[PDB]
Amino acid sequence: GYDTPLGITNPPIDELLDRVSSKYALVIYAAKRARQINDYYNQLGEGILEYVGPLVEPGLQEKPLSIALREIHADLLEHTEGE
């Protein structure tokens, strides 16, 4: 129940934290996936498709971190916490 968020406040932070134990885990959860997406884009030209690109279809020139957050919010990723 709220007006649609716009900018870097989308997706809403509470809905993201609903899926991760704590924000300190969420930051890594998003950063590692952003690195994976960036590596996939870098190797798009030629290379083994070991890193799978974005799951949710990206927008017109959307940053890898934003895509990572959006696909985290869509329940398409799984993470295991160290120690």
Binding site: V52, G53, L55, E71, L76, L77, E78
Partner: peptide, 9 residues
Amino acid sequence: TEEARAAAY
């Protein structure tokens, strides 16, 4: 997740 990897390809 396995379902996402299957759906994408």
